[PDB]
Structure 1
């Protein structure tokens, strides 16, 4: 292995149950939060001075047909940076030159290593897939199908639109699910009923507002927000948020933003 190991968390769509999924998601959360530094919401490590040896978390997805895919998640934002399939590695275009320095410490042992011209942002992936998030069905099935698409990509199955769609599925069911309890539950309920459904406004709005929320909550004047934030209900209606309290059972993780509160 390359100097200093990277923690791995396994999951499989074979005997996928609400229990296994919940354990998986909570395991990811439990490893992302290196320790302290939190009102009541856990904060993610600060990229500014985070050591390479503690920069990534590996998630090994296993399919019903024994098709493994190793997804690399950035511990500072819980987002997917790239993945390994067979003897190849594919990474999303490094938005920042410093991140490139980090990426080079990932799947070093692989024969083939590639880097996409596009980034990992939904807006981009959606254009490539020609499909909005509110169209792509989520659930255990879609994830199971996503694993396969990502796998055979390294051999010829490829088909860019399919590859892009698969990423949107994985990111939401893993990254987003670990970021908000709300989204975790949405995925859990789908498994609970063996269904497949596209996320509604409530889910999308949260995802699009993750950074916004993290900032506002971390910059809350003692307890209240600077200005109220408008979210969306299931039916698409919009409501205003003023405190972090109502958000406690909704949000799980936040990305580091400013000067920490004056663990002692």
Structure 2
């Protein structure tokens, strides 16, 4: 029994082909409703045969990697390249026991010393999110860099930067329609550009926005959380109705 697999390729990717890809990622993630915003499945009690989904990516050089996405928080937990599989360091032993059920066929299994969170990947990559280009070009380059890590051809700083690109255009593009729209604009005009402060702010606030929405009374927040306009200037929202077209998935709380 294999997990659900989603196929996307950067070779000739259009605005529509990438939209259908992200729309497919949201579908497999929200299989397990009534809420106006879909709520990701609960970690406790979730049987392992529905704990993950696989997102395989290819590029113009026909190089392929498969990313493993947890379904409770839509985060990449590891990836397989050829005959090897790589996993971030798990948070507890329950998650360490869950990851031995993916890629049960590879010959080489490795667990990194570090977690997959952004601030760690930015230290490893030697660059911040505001300095890492996003787009189809940066994604095609990442895919080649993920695989060639299995052959010793990619060093760790390039691998960490490649994770930052992939996590933003798959995981963050699923969570927020706003971020997916930002990626679709880069594909539309064939331009690579780093995320503006309105995007980093949403990525860091996903857990905090997931808090205020499920804990909202009639849709009103208890305390206002603050977002950023694209010019860096800040504001504050107080209810769910302004974020409905903005956020698509929420971790359970």
Q: For each residue in 1:58-95, what CA deviation from the matched residue of structure 2 results, as whole angstroms up to 9, or x when unmatched?
A: 01101111101000000111110000001000001011
Note the C-alpha offset of 1:221. 1.6
Contact 2:85 2:108 (C-alpha < 8 Å) held by counterparts: yes
Note the C-alpha offset of 1:36. 2.5
Note the C-alpha offset of 1:8. 0.2
Note the C-alpha offset of 1:108. 1.2
- Determine the C-alpha separation between the residues in 1 that align with 2:44 and 2:119: 26
- Determine the C-alpha separation between the residues in 1 that align with 2:64 and 2:108: 17
Note the C-alpha offset of 1:5. 2.2
- Determine the C-alpha separation between the residues in 2 that align with 1:211 and 1:45: 14
- Determine the C-alpha separation between the residues in 2 that align with 1:158 and 1:97: 30
For structure 2, the residue ranges without an aligned partner over 5 or more in a row are none
Note the C-alpha offset of 1:158. 2.3
Note the C-alpha offset of 1:148. 0.5
- Determine the C-alpha separation between the residues in 2 that align with 1:144 and 1:223: 41
Note the C-alpha offset of 1:31. 0.8
**Equivalent residue pairs, number:** 253
- Determine the C-alpha separation between the residues in 2 that align with 1:122 and 1:111: 29
Note the C-alpha offset of 1:35. 3.9
For structure 1, the residue ranges without an aligned partner over 5 or more in a row are 258-264
In structure 2, the partner of 1:6 is 3
Q: For each residue in 1:210-241, what CA deviation from the matched residue of structure 2 results, as whole angstroms up to 9, or x when unmatched?
A: 00000100000222101111100000000010
Task: Name the stretch that deviates more: 221-230 or 138-147.
Answer: 221-230
Note the C-alpha offset of 1:170. 0.2
Q: Structure 1 residues 196 and 182, CA, compared in 2 at 3 Å: closer, same or farther?
A: same
Q: The residue matched to 2:242 in structure 1 has which SS?
A: helix
- Determine the C-alpha separation between the residues in 1 that align with 2:169 and 2:21: 11
Q: For each residue in 1:110-156, what CA deviation from the matched residue of structure 2 results, as whole angstroms up to 9, or x when unmatched?
A: 01010100000000000001100000000000000000000000011
TM-score, with structure 2 as normaliser:
0.99
In structure 1, the partner of 2:151 is 155
TM-score, with structure 1 as normaliser:
0.95
